[PDB]
Amino acid sequence: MSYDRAITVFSPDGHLFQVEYAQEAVKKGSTAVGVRGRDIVVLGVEKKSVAKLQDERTVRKICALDDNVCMAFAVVASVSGLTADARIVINRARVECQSHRLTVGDPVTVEYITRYIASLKQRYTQSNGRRPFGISALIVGFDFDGTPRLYQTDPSGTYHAWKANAIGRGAKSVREFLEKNYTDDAIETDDLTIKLVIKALLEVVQSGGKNIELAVMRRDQPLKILSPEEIEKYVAEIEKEKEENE
Amino acid sequence: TTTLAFKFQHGVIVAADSRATAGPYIASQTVKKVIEINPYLLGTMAGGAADCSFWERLLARQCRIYELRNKERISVAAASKLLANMVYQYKGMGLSMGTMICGWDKRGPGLYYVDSEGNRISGTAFSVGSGSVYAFGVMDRGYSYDLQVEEAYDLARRAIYQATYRDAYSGGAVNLYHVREDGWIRVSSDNVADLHDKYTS
Amino acid sequence: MSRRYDSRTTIFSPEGRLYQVEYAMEAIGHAGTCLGILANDGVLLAAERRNIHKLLDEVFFSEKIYKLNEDMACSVAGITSDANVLTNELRLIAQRYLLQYQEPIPCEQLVTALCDIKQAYTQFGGKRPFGVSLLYIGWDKHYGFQLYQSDPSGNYGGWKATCIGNNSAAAVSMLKQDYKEGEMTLKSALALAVKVLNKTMDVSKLSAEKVEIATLTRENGKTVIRVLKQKEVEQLIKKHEEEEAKAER
Amino acid sequence: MSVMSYNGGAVMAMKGKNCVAIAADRRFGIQAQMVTTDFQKIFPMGDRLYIGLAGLATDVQTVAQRLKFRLNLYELKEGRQIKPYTLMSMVANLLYEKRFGPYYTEPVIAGLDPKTFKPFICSLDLIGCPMVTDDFVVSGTCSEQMYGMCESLWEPNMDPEHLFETISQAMLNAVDRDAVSGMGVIVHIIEKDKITTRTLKARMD
Amino acid sequence: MEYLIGIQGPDYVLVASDRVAASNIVQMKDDHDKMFKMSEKILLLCVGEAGDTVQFAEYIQKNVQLYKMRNGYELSPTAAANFTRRNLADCLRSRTPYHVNLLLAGYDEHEGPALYYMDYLAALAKAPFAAHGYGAFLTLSILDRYYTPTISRERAVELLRKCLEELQKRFILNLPTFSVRVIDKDGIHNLENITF
Amino acid sequence: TTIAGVVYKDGIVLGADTRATEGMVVADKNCSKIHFISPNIYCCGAGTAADTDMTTQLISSNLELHSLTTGRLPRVVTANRMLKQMLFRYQGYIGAALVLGGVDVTGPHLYSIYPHGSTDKLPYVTMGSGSLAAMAVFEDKFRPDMEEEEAKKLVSEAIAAGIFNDLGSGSNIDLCVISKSKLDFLRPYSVPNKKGTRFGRYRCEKGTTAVLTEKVTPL
Amino acid sequence: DRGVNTFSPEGRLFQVEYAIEGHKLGSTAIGIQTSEGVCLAVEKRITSPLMEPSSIEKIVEIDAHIGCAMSGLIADAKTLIDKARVETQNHWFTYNETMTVESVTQAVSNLALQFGEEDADPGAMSRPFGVALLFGGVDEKGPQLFHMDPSGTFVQCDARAIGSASEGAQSSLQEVYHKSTTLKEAIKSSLIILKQVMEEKLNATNIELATVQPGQNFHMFTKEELEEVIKDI
Amino acid sequence: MAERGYSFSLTTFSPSGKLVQIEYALAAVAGGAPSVGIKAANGVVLATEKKQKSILYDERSVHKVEPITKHIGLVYSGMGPDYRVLVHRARKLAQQYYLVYQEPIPTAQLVQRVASVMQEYTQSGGVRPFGVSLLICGWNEGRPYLFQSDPSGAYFAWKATAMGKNYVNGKTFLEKRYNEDLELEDAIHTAILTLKESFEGQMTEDNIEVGICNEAGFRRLTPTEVRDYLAAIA
Amino acid sequence: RFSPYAFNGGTVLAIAGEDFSIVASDTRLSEGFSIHTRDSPKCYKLTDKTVIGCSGFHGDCLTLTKIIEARLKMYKHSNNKAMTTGAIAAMLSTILYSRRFFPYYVYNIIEGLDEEGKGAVYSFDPVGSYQRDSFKAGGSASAMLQPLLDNQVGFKNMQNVEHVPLTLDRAMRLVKDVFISAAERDVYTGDALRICIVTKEGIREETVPLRKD
Incomplete structure (x- = not known):
């Protein structure tokens, strides 16, 4: 065109500007946590801002x-959902x-998807008159093996596998509380893995089952996005467990 | 259902059986040759007939799968090799055709065998073969073939089949290249001549 | 030369917003009231008709109520200019989907195709985003009745009741106060929508020249898209107007 | 709307004119050439739902062409309030067919329609490569279009009743399935009026 | 083109469909263990029938398309909608240089009427129906169902209709076909039915 | 099939045609106008195969429209010839259209006959459709090669009437199109040579030969 | 304002001088050619135990007997590696044998500098990549280690280091590493040099080693092998 | 013959939330010739000032008042060059439509088509919008029609509208002088009066062009016919 | 094989015998395009290094197009791969031409006879459709079996001990070459003038013209 x-033009700081502007926009908010189980991987976002x-059904x-x-996905600002920005990465992916x-x-x-995210960000960099998306995605899925995986990507396009990670509103803070909650029993029992996602989301700001949406995948079976009614029951049971350990 | 690269499944291995042949079936252009080529150590295949055509499609299949297997650190299956070959060849069609390769690998749902031909047929069966004269051969072989034959047990099966086959067959200047494939490895049992095995057995 | 002139409005900001979408966001707010409410037998849209004179041709069905398909209809908050190109494009997309699927298009499926285009402008290219935010109303087989909102980069949200335009905070809070998640029928649903438009708008009795209200109602298994005429609208105004009168007492 | 060839997918339309109305009969069968096994699937489309065009023969080209035309019809219908006339659609169809090369769409059109919402009747039939003809007499259309026109010109009093007509046109269909072999069994009549669609089910062999 | 052998008998207790495993090139059978009904989704089937090669070809593309709608909508796609979309996709391929006539056989779960089978002709024609055959065989089997019709027919009676056909097929038909896969489908899973 | 002629006379141009438009030798329609009126300035007679002729006139009419408006010159028949020759080449010499373009420039009235060839053909007075030579042959015969306008108008009408008589394909009304460059007088009935016999007697029937079990209006 | 495309009075381009700095930002990678084989060592440098250490990679395969360690922006390199995978197998279709370290490296380097920020095709770079790659393998010719720069200057090495320690490490290699040092000793030399740029001590979850040795294909060292070199440093 | 084009941000939103370019384009049309369109409901009449301020212009074929096609015409106000490409473009769309349908393009349909063009000029960079406001007239499908399209790419429906200099006063004089359910003759009379209320003073028949639109077609009258009308009006 | 239509014929017959490091390639010394032979001089054989000698024959139009190309592929290969032309050059060229000629049917059999740049001798045979194989006997032309046999019987020594009880030496192959050419004239009637045998070594190119006997 x-x-x-x-x-985007290269910096002597040894970075690409957009990528760093994006990275802070995932520091400042939109808590997305993922844990990897032993039959099932669960990812959760907090905020759809259900007022x-x-x-809640079609969103x-x-x-x-x-x-x-x-x-x-996550990256936020004053323009709070960057659903649009995500929606491109989502359709091509x-x-x-x-x-x-x-x-x-x-x-x-x-x-495969994680290398594909690393190349989409990059391709947008090299092309004239074009800019990297701000998204960070927690890519969940199953291989050839049938092994549950949780991988996390950054706005540059570098990927690592992780058993449990939290990003948004202090990535390291939510993850270090959640680090105690990641135990051998928690990963084994599928039901305990669903609670682990919800239990992390609750640390930043507590309550709401409508704000929290999480989607579950079991084996190579299709994605099931859980009802908010299922979430509300679950936050109530999580809050009592916190009092039990402590 | 036809020769030139043929495979039949067992649990333990697959049998890979192939011909060394040059040109059409009317004369050879050489005598020394092995047309058998190792594209990946996943298995061996090699044909004849329209020579450029078989080599071309397998070479694409070999490129795609090998890059994906090697970089990803995830082993490609019978199903994947077959899907690449299929997708490529119909597109390329109208630029001569005659690919007859037999795809093997062991998968999550157990051992899978798919037969890839240049029509666009993709088949699993007791024994399948793509190329030409094995079409007759699948008849006697099925009788003498169990669902699961051991490797050693299978080697003896090939030797008898062949030894009668040379008597019936009137194609000369061939070798039976025998390979057993134990999964994502390929080893060569023996490369015995068709003229030798009639005397032995 | 060329980059210098380029104000670098296509650049990301550290906070994680696009300057253009934010400036477009303001363009929607200047402009008139467009609100959509969900009801349980149909769904309705109420939009501000801003074409009042005594000499009007009415060469169009309406200049803000657009029937995009033969199963969808929409209303406008933003700029009429952007609205006209956009409205045509919305028609090719709605109509092609109708050809392939042969069932009414989801309100969600309809905002997403456009979104790519909106996003394209903002991020790169240095092209303005569209100055309108659209409230699409429809019924699709899968969820039943739905309302979808699109924004200037194609950011989407499914809403039972939402409002954008002039006195957007006032309209949405008020409507939140009486109605919360689908407590009313189609009859009552028109009376709230006109009531909200009434308070927001400078004329506090309205007529049918001031408001234009469109209904999309599922009858005998098929979606009917009808722009209501001036006559039907006056009846709805008298019903809300009377309800307001009792309130005082 | 439009299709490829003439009887290679069945379909035959005949119209008799009434002062008030137009009556149209067509079999309701479907399936290629001789076989007309299944009976549930349409050939006639509505282009205002008080104007119709029907193209008759192979179903593939019937649904692909009909839908692709509908998108453009629709955009014009929404834009200008006055939804496109009879006259506008005959010409639109002529230009749309001639335009193709690959898989040549040669329909034999029967337009069955009073214009707009107004009470002025039209019936027309077109040729295979379907140059437009204005007429207000009577129309029969299909591979053997000229046979149905002859007979459609001979049957009426002048303009029988709409009631009388559904019965005539149904009988016109019944004799014709015997004259061809590419269609047969099941008959549907659409009496097309200026404010309503009366759908009537005629007796089948 | 029609000179396969399919039958699908729709009822709302079950839908029984059977096909031969008999994809033959040369003189012997390349497939004779592969199933001829392909899984688009776990409650949806497409049965591609025509030439041996063209069958495998039609399915893989289609499989991607069904799943994709499932993802997009975030519910199971509408049966009506899929069947029409599978008709547009087979007509689009018809334009393309390799001319492909394909008989598709749609099994879907619809909002009504119950278990449903939507029927596809080699005129590349989508049609709602009850009582269908695919292949050269369509012509005789549709007719047998026509003498004795039931569209709520129980499983025992389904076996009787089948058996009068199977003995006929063995001696009068050019398909003696002792190799068949027969399946009866309830709305939740695929169950395997007796083969004669 | 069709019988069309247009003439260069001592006045302007008179086009003569039989009604019937046929898909081959069989009538698709027994109503409408074979000689077509386009914009105000351009009239075109049509002959040979129907499918090729109507569409060619229509496509050139858009092109000619653009050229007329911009240039603000009245249409020239030589100009009209070149446009048909270029368009028909684009298509690749598919179908049969013998086309009669006739328009009045600021000079004399000019008439041309373009066959499907994609030629640059200058007539003297021409008739088209059928066989080009066979129709053209008449002009040499009845016209002394210029006579007064009124005498010439009766002459074309008489010659065209003979082709209608000799060749039964043409049927119904004979239309004469008197064409200037803003005046298009479309005289439906110059001569009616033949017409049908009244369809007074029915072949209608009561329901007892076919019946109806439905009368309903869907929503 | 002034552009970035311009040459400076120093006699170098601005974009390119920045790209070298980008190489310096990332993690250190050592590639040593020994005549017993070619070893590539890279630091993981993990800060969390919740990560799975296998999936932190910075050694990716160009070929099935050539391994590559990459330095600077991890993401920016990955694209060059994606294009490299397609060429090596492509080379197998045409030549009918596998690609050499030299052939692959010169072909990626042509792409490295092409940059025209305005009025240049979107199928071509607006800015150069800030990555230095180390292509280390043994191929038909023998053990070869080639070094590639973001300036698109390729040169043959025996011991090269790139990343934050790039100048420091490279000097230090020339000293210990020679062609009178065996392959296992090369692995010990790399480990010591690695520690200054690392935040912690050397471990088997804080290095990733892979050696391609004659007559063998590329092997990714297992936990036991990593641990044997850790014992004696 | 070597260029890629430039597309740059002066065509993106300002902080005010309104588009910088549209306001300026509306200023270009305000500076223009006044133009009134009145739908009679017995035909559509459009009047403009013929003059260009020197009357050494031949204009017996060059007009401000141009037919697009058989019964649809455009009258403009604002910029002369920009209008010239819009006249030419509008015709091209009309004939494209003419090929398919046989009827000439409706005023309702035509404006959307034209609107896309106005839009490209605003939204992409390295261009600028057209500064011409259009009065689009037709009589088709049993009703006479008047549309407005302003330079931004908005189209508005009016039954009596005024443009250019003293666009505000024209709309009020139209409201006052013209009433509903009057005839065509009355319409023609009122337009020349709106032009009197919209730049005042001396008129000759080479300072005005009046064109009348019916299903017979749009025609711009000859200099003589326009002269007779002048004498009627005050 | 095929009877010249697709491309012009230019007759000629190629025999090839591989020993262990000496390989003889023979084809007739003629340039044809028409039934008569234009001139005895030819440039069918072209040498690229002393390491590799290529022979393209038959149709003269094919012969010039591919042989020059082979010189280009050699140049490219020395630069990039860093292996001097030889075996490696040979495998690569046969794929690209054989795609090119085989839809519109192949009328040239190019034979790369060389040593690898690492060593080991290869003699390579295409049918005309891509195959490369190493051989110790080769027959190529329409008569793609007429020479093949002599090399199968004499070189391989399969049911033969009277050409050599083992396998031929360099001295022995050159003696046999003159004999074989004299024989060919008798059977194959598509030759005129002279037969040229080039003996390709890693250390000596030899050329000899031999009159048609």
């Missing part, structure tokens, strides 16, 4: 890229997942 005006008049902030790959499954008869792994 005609637009080739600079938006008790909004719809998606966790989107299924595939039936064995799902991502939960959706076709690519399906596409990989047509060509290669193994079910697409999270490791």
